[PDB]
Amino acid sequence: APVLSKDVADIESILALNPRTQSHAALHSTLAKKLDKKHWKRNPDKNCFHCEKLENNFDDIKHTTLGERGALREAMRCLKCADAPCQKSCPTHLDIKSFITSISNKNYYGAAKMIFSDNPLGLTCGMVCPTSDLCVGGCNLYATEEGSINIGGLQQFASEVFKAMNIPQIRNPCLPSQEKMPEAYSAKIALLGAGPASISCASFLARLGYSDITIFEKQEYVGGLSTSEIPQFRLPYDVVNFEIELMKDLGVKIICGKSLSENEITLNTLKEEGYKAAFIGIGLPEPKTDDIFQGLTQDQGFYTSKDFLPLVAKSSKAGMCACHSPLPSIRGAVIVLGAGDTAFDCATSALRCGARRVFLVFRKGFVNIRAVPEEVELAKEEKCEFLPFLSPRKVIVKGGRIVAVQFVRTEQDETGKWNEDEDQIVHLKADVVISAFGSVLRDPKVKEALSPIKFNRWDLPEVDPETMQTSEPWVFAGGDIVGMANTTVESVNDGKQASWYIHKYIQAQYGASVSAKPELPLFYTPVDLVDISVEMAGLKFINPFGLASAAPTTSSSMIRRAFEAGWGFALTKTFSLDKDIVTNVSPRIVRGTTSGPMYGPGQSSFLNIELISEKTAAYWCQSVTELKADFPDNIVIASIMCSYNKNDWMELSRKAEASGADALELNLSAPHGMGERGMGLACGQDPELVRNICRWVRQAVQIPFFAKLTPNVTDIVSIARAAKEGGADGVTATNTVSGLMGLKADGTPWPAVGAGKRTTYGGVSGTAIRPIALRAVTTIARALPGFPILATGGIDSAESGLQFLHSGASVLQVCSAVQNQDFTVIQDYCTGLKALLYLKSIEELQGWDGQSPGTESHQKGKPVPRIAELMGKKLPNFGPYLEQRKKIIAEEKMRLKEQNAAFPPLERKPFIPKKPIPAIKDVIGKALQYLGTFGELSNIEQVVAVIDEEMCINCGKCYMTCNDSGYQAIQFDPETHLPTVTDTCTGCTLCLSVCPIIDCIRMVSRTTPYEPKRGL
Amino acid sequence: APVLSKDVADIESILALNPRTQSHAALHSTLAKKLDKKHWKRNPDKNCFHCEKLENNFDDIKHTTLGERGALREAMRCLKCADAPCQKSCPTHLDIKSFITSISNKNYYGAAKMIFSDNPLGLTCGMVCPTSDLCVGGCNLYATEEGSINIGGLQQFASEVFKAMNIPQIRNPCLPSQEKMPEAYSAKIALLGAGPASISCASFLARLGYSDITIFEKQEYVGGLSTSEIPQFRLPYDVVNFEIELMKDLGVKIICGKSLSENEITLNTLKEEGYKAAFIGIGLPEPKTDDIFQGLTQDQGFYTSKDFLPLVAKSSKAGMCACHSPLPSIRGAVIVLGAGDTAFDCATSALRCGARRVFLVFRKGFVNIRAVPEEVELAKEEKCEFLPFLSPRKVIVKGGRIVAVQFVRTEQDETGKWNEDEDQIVHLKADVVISAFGSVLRDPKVKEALSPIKFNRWDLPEVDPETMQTSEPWVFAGGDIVGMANTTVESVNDGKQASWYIHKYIQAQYGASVSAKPELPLFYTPVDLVDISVEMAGLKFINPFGLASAAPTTSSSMIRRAFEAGWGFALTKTFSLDKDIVTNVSPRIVRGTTSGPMYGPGQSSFLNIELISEKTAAYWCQSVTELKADFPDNIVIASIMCSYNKNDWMELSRKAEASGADALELNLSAPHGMGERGMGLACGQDPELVRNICRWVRQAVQIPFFAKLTPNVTDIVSIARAAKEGGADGVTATNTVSGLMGLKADGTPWPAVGAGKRTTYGGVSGTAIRPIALRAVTTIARALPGFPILATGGIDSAESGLQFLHSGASVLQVCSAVQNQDFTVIQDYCTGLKALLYLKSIEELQGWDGQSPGTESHQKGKPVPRIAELMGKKLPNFGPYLEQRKKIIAEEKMRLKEQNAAFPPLERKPFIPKKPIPAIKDVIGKALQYLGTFGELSNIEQVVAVIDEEMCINCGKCYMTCNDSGYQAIQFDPETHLPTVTDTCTGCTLCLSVCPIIDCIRMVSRTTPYEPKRGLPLA
Ligand code: SF4
């Protein structure tokens, strides 16, 4: 037959682009290189001066937006620091460490709950916060080459997933029923203006239990600037609606078309109507004007930011206003005056209206720009021109329209004073002029309505910076109107701050006092009501998470703090009789090398050569008595160890039982014998020894006890069965895996002890051994149905915990995840498990995998345009293909503009459980039904790989894996770098396994009878 | 006794900043927050308009510089793409995929070798290449939120490590001896100008074997613009010297003080002197001038970039010149005219000279700036002011000094053209003016020296863009002088391109032809001569790396390509007799979840439920015959499997032997007949069955055979011993670990097969099982000294491979590392192992760990200034503390400027092996001496953790780990966020294990005797 070990022509051809080591240096002329470079170009071209058409294009342009794949990577990178500087730098004091930890553990619900607990507008802020000047500006990772964490994008992602869950906010469960609430909580409360400040203030007051809260809004739309001015391409209106509805879930009422103004609503009319407190959150309603613009109209081409931005918003935000308004017709050159946030949004928004060119003109220099670099970047990347040191002097109008603006030179002299040079002028041609000089409060009727509160020299309501209280005790203020806040988050914080003192004030008015220490409630939803208790071997666990017998339980004081944090149970470090006292060596605990040279958070494993507790049995027994006395509902299991001696095991187990331990855990690590009988050296490796030890203990104590099994055995089931036959009430699976973590290049080990640099085999723990522990738990669960199992081995999240429950375990022990972090992870594990169970009752979310929404086609986490004009056209996101995609998208936007139509956000409506929420007992062992022998697997129902071209990032890893580890079934296009799976695919699934994009490749049922390649 | 389970006051205090979940929302006023924010500030403050003192400060300001920690992370992130677009976008076509792969595997030598093979100025380019407009601009990862790879910084890092190794370049090993070289290679070759272009050209010609190469340089210094103008704070002079010395290692001669000029060296004098070929690489020697600056002197305050930058370079670059040069005195406001690379370097350099303020003024708009964004960013972050649309008209001079510059306004019209508005002027005050209008070749004497070559309409030497040849056959040109190159890398490529055709031309002149296909040699060093062959069980392996019996050996055609790539040996996929033919299911191979939701490169493991080969024994046996016929020196081992039947094992083993296999590997995964004793179910789990199977095969064949052991046993040594007693020539340790990779939230498994979404236990492979495999190999090696062991289990680099060799294995099998990449990793493994062995002979590098230099105090990978006024001040790199550090550093720079000196430049000298380079046989089992029982470990020689404040990034992880997983022995300062290990430390070593900064924490011998905490006195 032909040469079997040679590729035929067809395969040789398919392997054309497969990596091969070159034996010589390559030769390619500089000219050839210049001509080839443009074909692969991904990023902006420095030599390109035009901005892709953006007319009527309101797609998200934020650089911080993240998809799940990207969010998980960034969340894992976060160091999750103690006393985190990022949190200290966040105006609402968000517990960034905790919410990012939750995201890293795939607990998006927990992350969102943490975010909204401190910031009711968590999604809006995640999208618009100028992080470089806030939280991110203080991030410790700024001290690394890779840089600071994208905190805003992470916050946005978790909040977006929560929004998708369609779960409502609920009243505080710890609160008395509505009818049992003191009279004071029915006090009529009024807030003016429905912006971030009032929304936040009303939200917190509602959390506190106040039942009569009304926000009076002047306009017909709600959300304040988030709605009327911030562009849709930075902050989607549906986000604002989402946060407003969450607030309304608490009973807050909003009345539009009502203004704080003389002859309308005034502080006097409110007081007269019985309102007990009022919060002023009307912001700065008017534009800062300039004499040189007097009399100019929109028809001539002049707008203040207050005129222009709301026009664009009303036209691009479906759901904002009830009308359908065409977009402002901005043609020609546009001059935007100013250098604050507003100026840049006017510049980018002008492009959406059709502007041919946009000039951002400021009276100072580049160094003096007010907006954060990230905001400036957006206008810069869209090719807006920047003209520094120019002050407006005259606007030229001809034929009823603006045609130019004359400026004068500005300059800083020595003394630092900014001066204008009359003799140095600039005549700039322009068709449209937009002033972005800021906003103010001027309306005499509005100010009069605030009588008689004191106004400062800035002509703004004066308030105490700590209480947000005005000169009138019952009146408070916050947000832009106070003149301190520069952001949405600070305005939110102003309302938050004010809510506590408004509460204090109202309570006092009803003769009631409040805690000296501020106690604003957290954010709650129905998920928090989910019961995650479980019963095992006659013991009641408040939650299935506990500390394994290990470093985290080195001292009983640590267990106390763990219980205080919320852990369901805990194991004492293994202890023994005085005669068996041990002494540890050092170093003894090292990081795993199981996932490469990655240091810091999330070590994939640890290796330890630590012995049992160095503390005495007397210490542990007295400690157990104390712990059980102070934490009666938290389970305490005493871990004990003796040599193979009946009297010892009986003596120690009885001492532990007498201390008040809920149960005992038998550590079977003690040696015995020679070592060739095929059953190792430890007692736990010999069924006969295990059976006898359990018999001795069963005979000595009445409380339940579990045998902790080692995975270092041929058949762990035989050991489990022996423990059961001996009388054990269950087994703990499993202890550490024996191993050697590695050696340095010189051959010395790590850990290395003493001058001799010696070491001994240690135990591997962590996620790296989870596959071993998961197998152990499932095999035991299948062989001994109903026999209690306490799982241990790489549990580091609610998700992984649920995997073990599904595999047959009743409770979950943790060590490494805590060594990688701290005791507070229990908060993440509990909210995470509640969410996973809750979601199982929601019919409309069945397509999700736990808390992960079904993956949708995207690029950089942003949804791919499903335009018929782009589908199947094989247009990669680079070079000339990218240009084509941009042209097609632009044309689509123009078409959407011609056919003015749409507005159905189909009002937000919460999903309701359509079945009982599963209890832990309902999920235990549910995965066992899928496990079996290889013979039970169908070899008829085969699959093949299918690639989603739209999600591909053209790396060719699928191609390389199939070539050198598969069946050479993928074609990799030499021009587009797009892969195509051919009919020779066998469905091995390696390509999907190495793809960097989650769900880009999927395995689907084969459409033709499969035929094994026999080579023959 | 007191409450034992409660922390006493002092511990409660130490735990003050320990994480605790809050039960209520926090309350902090907006004002309080505004006041607290400045204390923790890390990045630049947007409201800061002032320029931090940079006078005489030439510290590295590149944002791309990487330290080992950072380089490893970035290298692992790289997708190591096929037909990589980054490489296509690199002017010198560097194999970025390969060099980055080597860095991720800790093989810095291999990475540097790959880099220098295609770019002789690899270090300079790593530091100065405008990557956003080159390699990085085409990076596939740009399509991800985290963004493109820092290719330049990675190149810089690998090259810097190689530079530190002090290893010389050597002549091409496959070249005939110097004496046996054809006469043509002695042809006298001349190159004009010692810049990137000529250095590259001379280097490649030298690689080809030419022995008489001379570069004539006009100045007294070498390196061209890299030396004379690129700032020391972007490109250290020692980098240039390094690359020059590497070139000189090949025999290239450099003569300074010699100019290509009519009254000196000309093409005619060279031809007359017998030179056979000449390369013109003199760049653009003169500044582009403007009539408005006529007559202005430096004393008045005027400089062209050609006057200014060299002055700064000569004073800041130790070694450049023989005389110490003063730093130009630039005081007051400085105006830099232009928007190209030069303008920005003039602006930043002006600040080092003491400028109070710097204005970058250009005649076009911001969008029209020529320099890449990264270059612009440096001037921007240093507070340089930018003034667009201004064209210079007059330099106002009063009192013999420039006091201002008058400009006119500019603008683009309705067609794109640019105009100047006379009526719109600007009068800008300034004390110094620096024109950065570019450079040109104008000297008539230099042009005349190039007669009679043709010049184009641009007034530059004309050359064929493919051959770099001028109108005169024996004269070539490249670099800036040609006018196409815009970068160092392109100039380097011009010289590279030219070397091949210069070679072709010279050979032809001597009546010899050259290959139609270009064959420039790679870069070589003594490391490449290191022997990594090894003998085991009577078999000779050219190198210890081979493909394990697995997916990568699914087909014999794949093994062929693997051998073509360089793999030492390979196992066939396990095959059997026709009656035992199997049929796979799908899906069957999935990624590991052992290191979290990290997708793409470097999966920490894989799980498979694949069976043995679906191809017949006939296919495999014929394939083995073919492979051994075509690759006699590559070892082929046939993996076979039968049920527990004597006749079957004897039949199959004989069939495999008859095919010509060098040896056999027995797969012991076949089940037995009913159990009876936690003896698993597979033959490989029962010593008795293993012994019998090996006995049957031993009686059947004469070639060596190895038993592949499963790690899924209580005592693997008992199985290894059984195989030995049975007659096996060795054992393969080990096969995959039994496991379940995971379940989806709905409880279904992955892999999930069929409509029933079923699965079965699979085998875990990859780095996640390496600890298990390493234990297996070491225990067998200790129990059966000298018994051959073939290692398998997480081997993915030369470094990890050496760990197994040290543990007792002779050869190394690989599977997962290839599944994660491709066959070309063998190149990294071989150069990596050669480097590791070579370095063991270098006495001056004993403090290194393999290829890793000892870690020094760094922040962001940049050396921490060892200033007396900083060490021990407890000044973290943030908030007010950072301000103080900067003030101290600035004062130090001023003192160095005043406490003058700096003639100590070194005499670059290669390290020479001071002992024989170890062979593989010399390292095997060397680690065993350190392994023993727990009782053999000293409990007297204890250690404690010690933290290097200067390397700390204030995360508090050490603190949190000791608090909830240790002994509450670390104090974490509430103001500086600096940790301090106290005397209660027990040396458990957890803090060091979780610290994100490599070597920030170190374990040191306890200075006080250790007393175990018993909690309660022992009675
Ligand atoms: S499932 Fe396997 S045979 Fe199919 S295209 Fe992916 S690596 Fe290749």
From Swiss-Prot, chain A:
- Pathway, according to UniProt? Amino-acid biosynthesis; beta-alanine biosynthesis
Top-rank taxon, per record: Eukaryota
Gene from which this protein is expressed: DPYD
| Organismal lineage | Eukaryota, Metazoa, Chordata, Craniata, Vertebrata
Give EC number(s), comma-separated.
1.3.1.2
**According to its UniProt record, which cofactors does this protein need?**
FAD; FMN; [4Fe-4S] cluster
Q: Where in the cell is it found?
A: Cytoplasm
Where, in this chain's numbering, is FAD bound? 128, 193-197, 217-225, 234, 260, 479-488
Q: Which residues bind substrate?
A: N608, N667, L668, S669, N735, T736
Query: What would changing C125A do, according to UniProt?
Result: No effect on enzyme activity. Reduced iron content
Record note on cofactor? Binds 2 FAD.
Instruction: Return the protein name.
Output: Dihydropyrimidine dehydrogenase [NADP(+)]
Report residues binding FMN.
Answer: S549, K573, T574, K708, G766, T792, G793, G794, C815, S816
Report any Pfam family annotated for this entry: Fer4_21
Which residues does the record give as [4Fe-4S] cluster 1 binding sites? C78, C81, C86, C139
Consequence when changing Q155E: Loss of enzyme activity. Reduces iron content
List the catalytic activities from the record.
Answer: 5,6-dihydrouracil + NADP(+) = uracil + NADPH + H(+); 5,6-dihydrothymine + NADP(+) = thymine + NADPH + H(+)
Description of how activity is regulated: Inactivated by 5-iodouracil.
What's this protein's function? Answer: Involved in pyrimidine base degradation. Catalyzes the reduction of uracil and thymine.
Major subcellular location class: cytoplasm
Please describe, based on the UniProt annotation, the reported consequence of changing R234 to A/K: Loss of enzyme activity. Loss of FAD binding
Which InterPro entries does this entry report, sorted A to Z?
4Fe4S_Fe-S-bd, 4Fe4S_Fe_S_CS, Aldolase_TIM, Dihydroorotate_DH_cat, DPD_II, FAD/NAD-bd_sf, FAD/NAD-binding_dom, Helical_ferredxn
Q: Which UniProt keywords apply?
A: 4Fe-4S, Acetylation, Cytoplasm, FAD, Flavoprotein, FMN, Iron, Iron-sulfur, Metal-binding, NADP, Nucleotide-binding, Oxidoreductase, Repeat
An example GO BP is: beta-alanine biosynthetic process
Residue ranges the record assigns to the propeptide: 1-2
UniProtKB/Swiss-Prot annotation, chain B:
Q: What is its EC number?
A: 1.3.1.2
Q: Which Pfam families match?
A: DHO_dh, Fer4_20, Fer4_21, Pyr_redox_2
UniProt: substrate binding residues:
N608, N667, L668, S669, N735, T736
Q: Which reaction does it catalyse?
A: 5,6-dihydrouracil + NADP(+) = uracil + NADPH + H(+); 5,6-dihydrothymine + NADP(+) = thymine + NADPH + H(+)
Any inhibitors or activators noted? Inactivated by 5-iodouracil.
- Protein residues bound to [4Fe-4S] cluster 3: C952, C955, C958, C962
Reported effect, R234 to A/K: Loss of enzyme activity. Loss of FAD binding
The function of this protein is: Involved in pyrimidine base degradation. Catalyzes the reduction of uracil and thymine.
Full protein name = Dihydropyrimidine dehydrogenase [NADP(+)]
**Which gene name does the record give?**
DPYD
